[PDB]
Design a protein around this ligand. Structure first.
Ligand SMILES: CC(=O)N[C@H]1[C@H](O[C@@H]2[C@@H](O)[C@H](O)O[C@H](CO)[C@@H]2O)O[C@H](CO)[C@@H](O[C@@H]2O[C@H](CO[C@]3(C(=O)O)C[C@H](O)[C@@H](NC(C)=O)[C@H]([C@H](O)[C@H](O)CO)O3)[C@H](O)[C@H](O)[C@H]2O)[C@@H]1O
Ligand SMILES: CC(=O)N[C@H]1[C@H](O[C@@H]2[C@@H](O)[C@H](O)O[C@H](CO)[C@@H]2O)O[C@H](CO)[C@@H](O[C@@H]2O[C@H](CO[C@]3(C(=O)O)C[C@H](O)[C@@H](NC(C)=O)[C@H]([C@H](O)[C@H](O)CO)O3)[C@H](O)[C@H](O)[C@H]2O)[C@@H]1O
Ligand SMILES: CC(=O)N[C@H]1[C@H](O[C@@H]2[C@@H](O)[C@H](O)O[C@H](CO)[C@@H]2O)O[C@H](CO)[C@@H](O[C@@H]2O[C@H](CO[C@]3(C(=O)O)C[C@H](O)[C@@H](NC(C)=O)[C@H]([C@H](O)[C@H](O)CO)O3)[C@H](O)[C@H](O)[C@H]2O)[C@@H]1O
Ligand SMILES: *[C@@H]1O[C@H](CO)[C@@H](O)[C@H](O)[C@H]1NC(C)=O
Ligand SMILES: *[C@@H]1O[C@H](CO)[C@@H](O)[C@H](O)[C@H]1NC(C)=O
Ligand SMILES: *[C@@H]1O[C@H](CO)[C@@H](O)[C@H](O)[C@H]1NC(C)=O
Ligand SMILES: *[C@@H]1O[C@H](CO)[C@@H](O)[C@H](O)[C@H]1NC(C)=O
Ligand SMILES: *[C@@H]1O[C@H](CO)[C@@H](O)[C@H](O)[C@H]1NC(C)=O
Ligand SMILES: *[C@@H]1O[C@H](CO)[C@@H](O)[C@H](O)[C@H]1NC(C)=O
Ligand SMILES: *[C@@H]1O[C@H](CO)[C@@H](O)[C@H](O)[C@H]1NC(C)=O
Ligand SMILES: *[C@@H]1O[C@H](CO)[C@@H](O)[C@H](O)[C@H]1NC(C)=O
Lengths: 489, 489, 490
């Protein structure tokens, strides 16, 4: 007596945004933005990071007496460093090309300390010099990785040292120069005035001269110490020559592991976890293509956008409004086996149903849409943090401009794409329902009476079999032609 | 006995383009590209700019005698400079890290001058030197903000001078070193050979030595002056030591207000006018998201693209070729809606408008336009940087980045406008067909279709009838028997 | 009598992808990505490049004896260099601002060597020194474009030299400083210790001092040579002065032409062809806006993406199967005249047809869409690739990040745009067929019997003229209204 065509409604309350309307309630929705972390600094690929504590990279490499817990350091995934470390250079001074050194350390996962110039080889000089700035238990001391050379008796002969890199990998060597505060200091320490420090390799040639002047007091001293570094290649020799003011190295750091890493600025401590993407606030465990947790990330991470919600409409519109009418008035609550379906009402009882073909096709289409949006984003290993000195403000501003531009582009594209796709899927569902209605109408032809709310009354008597035939798409119009014709007039 | 469904046409001649057609006439349109400007140089947020005129930043800071009008500069919003300033370094020479100083000046306002080393403290030297390159009224002169130390009598005692920064903010200090032309000049001015100039702070350590050589004549002189600068922190000291060739400062430059600003290269003058976005050709006053006036801007300005027109379709097509309905074309009689009815019966014809559909479509189009416009992020930013003559690669990098972003935004904006125009022009047609189908479903067999846009009834149906058809409360059973009777015959 | 509305099918096997479906067979497709090249290095705009071979730029400019074939070189479009050239600085040393020199010299396209300081004017010094580091036929030699000054007898007087730039354009000048190995070498070659080299222009001002120390042996020598360069403006003067350790120039390079060029790092040889875009693997000639051959290109080249397929659907969906049914049951194979058409079966004879107005409109729309996608992308001359020193790794990382970000942006945008436009095209074709069906039905009205498979069965006897009339759009309802009513009731 009746067969109606409609769609499915539920008790959901998820709202989605569209380029034409705002706050539209849908049956189902998928979130493609991640907003949750665990709030803990954790391991990366199972390898604990290098927790420097209150030390700095220079303090670790030079061997500050307050950083004695890092004399031997195992393999690491990344480096954790405070924004303002307290234990850096105990003796005041500088460190040439510090940022380049940090960037180099952002690509090595393990070192190996090798003794290259033993302290006992300097038989003609004093090697037991220290200062009150780097004091240990009230006694003056010095760095644990470098040697301070001083006159023995009243003579300072020319000091020579060499090292042939037979270790098996690239080696990093750090030396220093000393700038005293007065000519009295220079005479007391080296016995001669007008000295030089010469360092030379196969591709490096550097000569330095000490500067003697009165400077403001830092850590109680008016003197400074300038440190420089180099990368010694395999089977390559490095030569040291100096008449005074040479802070010679005793160890060299050879690169052993090599990989991808970075420096992260936090103020926390490592805990027991395991993650793939790490942020200064916490770790991220997701498969979504976007997130808004933090811009500075280390690892394989989703894209960062400046949005608050990015929801893709998967299901139909929720119009809870409902003999029983069809899809013109609204959705159906009693149909739970699919998306688009039927309701039949004859002399053998009423009931709902579902159309498997149309629902399956729509489901496949929506799944493919979501997959196309999600799996077309390329994810790699990147470290966003970068360090620039106070004389490189233009470079820092260029970096900041690039990051801001990329962020703006991705935010705009993501938001507009979500809005347009939501509009298209909301039109897709209505098109599907109307196509089903039109197919049923063209199959039924004049044998029925289109009421106008969404369904038809038959002009004949139809049992269950004819209802299934209409639902299955195998109506036999000529069989009921004569019977249905009589009742029309 | 007729009721037609159709849309609205006028005499507008605006033109829009879509992804499938070009040069399409529409009833209404919105331009989202700004192409006009005031033509003057304005004040940004009320504050007048700093007009240097014929002077450079170096000339203003060092105190060129021809820039004596800028000795007390008030608060400024941005800096106006010429491409090739005439009045810079009157005495030939160079300025170390000039572009970094300009970049620092990009983010400072008002500024304040304090005297740190009075010219009268140098009791053991001569302080009244001058040159003909910087001459006033024919007589030789020198920079206003600097002091040239020369021997007094026949001796040049060691020169010392210190300043403790108790002003209350960071400070900018500039000093210099003199490179003479021959040894006789050196002995005439300083009485000694082999001199040095040493400058030291808590984080700076610099020693410089004069170089004496024959050089080409610039402004009549074969000698040069080299200028350097530093940023002094609060409660920090700066020390000066020299045995010759020292150009000591007298005034120390102190930062008063900070913020966002920039440097604009222009050949104009300031006029009485105000804005929030500034361009070297004029001032922009618009709310649109895109503009094409000039790539270099200072302030809160729209995105710059290389396009001539970006027009959004907010209305229907103009097809006024005609009573007939929406199949043939639009109507001119409708003046209070987009979709409506024209009715014709025994008691007088006329037009009308469907309020619900028009309101829904108007809200949708307004939401679309607002979504396109309001999703753009506008923040203060100043395009334009300076690079020296040994930094071609950095300038090329900056140019490539800006060009890439420009290309991305241009392509995105054009394609988005095309696609949205196509979507809107399909949306209107779908709305009109929806109204037609709704009316047909309500009217059912009681009427006859015409393939033109309207229906001819099978009964007599007055204004209450026709309001009900427009209202949506047509009652089928009232005329079912009457309207059937005429249909068979 | 019948008239069915349908579309066109063929035997194509090309497939496109959409946002809702994958591997959809289409009648006509357009590939907008270029994947092929000629595999050879050719001339840009009809001008051969500069083939350095085994000598590097520094060795070419200094005049290394092993690349004497480059003493005079003609016009060039770009430069072909090897990744690790063999003949560079024969005498071990360094070269200041080398990358800046390469970047500047990548925009020159022609030089002109000019003798600025002849070797016969040094009448108080010995100018025949040479080394075994770069020797010819077993005898010591030196760089061809530079002069090594050594003491004459037992004296080294102060050396002075100047040049005024009257050539006509900017001129490039290179000089050097020699760093000995011990004091004995210094006293043997220059007779005094504590020397300097001073170079001065209207803008430049430089003073240098040699460094004497023991260094590891490279090419058997413990000494090094340091080279510097400058640009001399028109009507400017350059001054030289030295008490020792000066490698003076003899020639100067002036800039004849100026333009767009770059440096290619390849190990191939020039062959006879001509193109507008060049890659290290080959050359590209195309009108498509995308390619995936090689990231580093020189010329006006399409955008580079990380994709393997970018196909725009131009035609219809290809459902092969089709009394003769209409567009409900599938496409039509025998209608090779257009996209949307008809089919009739009357007494006089059956046959196919093709609607002209709808097909023309659809063709114009699709062509406009393709032209909008292609022609809106701006192509400019660009040379991708920069050289950075081993102490500027941060700048190299910055450049790499910029290039990678732009590559990802363009890749994502291109793939999503293709996926979207394919869906709109496939929906557009179905909309067109539906619109034609509805137009015929509403024009032609109750005089027929809709069959539901895509066409109608006329109730009257429609001859040919009526068939062209309904196909025309000028059907006459009142003519057959009375006759149709008679048979319909029965
Ligand atoms: C080794 C020592 O005690 N040196 C001090 C020096 O001693 C003189 C000795 O050389 C001479 O033969 O005999 C006289 C007595 O007749 C002295 O014993 O005397 C100086 C004062 O005249 C000291 O001055 C003060 O030293 C302070 C700090 O000492 C340390 C430091 O903690 O920095 C430690 C060592 O003295 C020294 N390290 C060495 C030699 O390896 C360093 C050294 O001076 C650095 O170069 C400091 O820049 O200094 C303060 O530096 C204070 O300002 C200064 O007046 C000598 O310490
Ligand atoms: C103070 C003065 O006039 N000096 C000139 C010098 O005169 C001498 C006297 O001071 C000395 O005791 O005895 C000798 C004789 O034994 C002189 O009587 O004579 C020089 C030539 O022999 C001058 O040369 C010319 O100076 C020019 C520049 O003068 C200025 C200038 O206009 O730039 C200004 C000052 O006169 C001069 N000195 C100071 C302290 O400012 C400076 C200075 O010389 C340089 O400009 C900077 O180092 O320059 C031209 O430079 C010209 O080329 C040169 O021949 C002495 O000016
Ligand atoms: C001219 C010459 O033969 N010099 C070699 C020198 O002979 C001395 C001569 O200068 C002196 O007047 O008289 C004594 C005899 O009383 C000698 O005859 O002897 C040196 C060894 O003690 C040399 O040693 C080796 O030279 C190698 C290469 O030599 C050359 C070269 O081809 O690079 C030869 C050039 O004539 C010489 N001069 C010039 C102006 O180019 C250069 C020059 O020394 C370079 O600056 C080297 O840095 O060197 C190797 O250099 C090897 O290491 C060295 O031991 C003198 O070559
Ligand atoms: C949509 O709903 C949110 C609450 O989730 C509300 O803040 C916002 O104002 C709503 N927007 C409109 C246009 O009503
Ligand atoms: C350094 O050691 C390698 C291998 O033992 C050797 O070939 C090389 O000659 C050595 N270097 C020097 C300067 O002898
Ligand atoms: C559209 O009109 C403009 C001028 O209004 C004209 O320049 C252009 O050629 C026209 N486009 C076409 C396709 O005719
Ligand atoms: C500079 O002045 C501040 C003011 O309190 C003082 O603390 C500081 O010690 C002074 N500097 C020196 C070097 O005395
Ligand atoms: C039309 O609809 C409105 C709905 O508010 C109703 O108030 C009015 O009585 C209706 N009029 C007719 C003639 O149906
Ligand atoms: C599409 O076809 C290709 C071969 O042409 C095949 O590799 C791929 O798996 C197919 N994809 C789907 C979804 O069937
Ligand atoms: C260099 O030549 C130009 C033109 O011949 C001349 O004007 C200039 O004075 C010359 N330079 C010098 C230092 O004389
Ligand atoms: C078809 O329409 C065109 C329109 O001008 C007309 O010229 C032609 O005669 C028509 N054909 C028939 C068979 O009516």
């Amino acid at each position: 007596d009746q067969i109606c065509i409609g769609y499915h409604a539920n008790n959901s309350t998820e709202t989605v945004d569209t380029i034409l309307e705002r706050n539209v309630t849908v049956t189902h929705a998928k979130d493609i933005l991640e907003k949750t972390h665990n709030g803990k600094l954790c391991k990366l690929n199972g390898i604990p990071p290098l927790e420097l504590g209150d030390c700095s990279i220079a303090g670790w490499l030079l061997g500050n007496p307050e950083c004695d817990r890092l004399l031997s350091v195992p393999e690491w995934s990344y480096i954790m460093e405070k924004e303002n470390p307290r234990d850096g250079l105990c003796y005041p001074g500088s460190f040439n090309d510090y940022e380049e050194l940090k960037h180099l350390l952002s690509s090595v996962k393990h070192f190996e300390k090798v003794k290259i110039l033993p302290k006992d080889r300097w038989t003609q000089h004093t090697t037991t010099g220290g200062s009150r700035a780097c004091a240990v238990s009230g006694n003056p001391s010095f760095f644990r990785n470098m040697v301070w050379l001083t006159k023995k008796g009243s003579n300072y002969p020319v000091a020579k040292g060499s090292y042939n890199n037979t270790s098996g990998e690239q080696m990093l060597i750090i030396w220093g120069v000393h700038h005293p505060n007065d000519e009295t200091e220079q005479r007391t320490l080296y016995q001669n005035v007008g000295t030089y420090v010469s360092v030379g390799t196969s591709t490096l040639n550097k000569r330095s001269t000490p500067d003697i002047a009165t400077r403001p007091k830092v850590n109680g001293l008016g003197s400074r110490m300038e440190f420089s570094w180099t990368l010694l290649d395999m089977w390559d020799t490095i030569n040291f020559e100096s008449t005074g003011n040479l802070i010679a190295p005793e160890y060299g750091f050879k690169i052993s592991k090599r990989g991808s890493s970075g420096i992260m600025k936090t103020e926390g401590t490592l805990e027991n976890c395991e993650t793939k993407c790490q942020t200064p606030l916490g770790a991220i465990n997701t498969t979504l293509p976007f997130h808004n947790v933090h811009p500075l990330t280390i690892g394989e991470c989703p894209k960062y956008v400046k949005s608050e919600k990015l929801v893709l409409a998967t299901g139909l519109r929720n119009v809870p409004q409902i003999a029983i009418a069809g899809f013109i008035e609204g959705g159906w609550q009693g149909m739970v086996d699919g998306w688009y379906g039927y309701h039949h009402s004859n002399d053998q009882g009423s009931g709902y149903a579902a159309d498997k073909e149309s629902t399956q096709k729509a489901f496949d289409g929506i799944t493919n849409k979501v997959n196309s949006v999600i799996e077309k984003m390329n994810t790699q290993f990147e470290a966003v943090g970068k360090e620039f000195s106070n004389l490189e403000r233009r470079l820092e501003n260029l970096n900041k401009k690039m990051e801001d531009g990329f962020l703006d582009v991705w935010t705009y594209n993501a938001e507009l794409l979500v809005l347009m796709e939501n509009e298209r899927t909301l039109d897709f569902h209505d098109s599907n329902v109307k196509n089903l209605y039109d197919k049923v109408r063209m199959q039924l032809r004049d044998n029925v009476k289109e009421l106008g709310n969404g369904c038809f009354e038959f002009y004949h008597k139809c049992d269950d079999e004819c209802m299934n035939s209409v639902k299955n798409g195998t109506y036999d119009y000529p069989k009921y032609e004569e019977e249905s014709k009589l009742n029309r007039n």
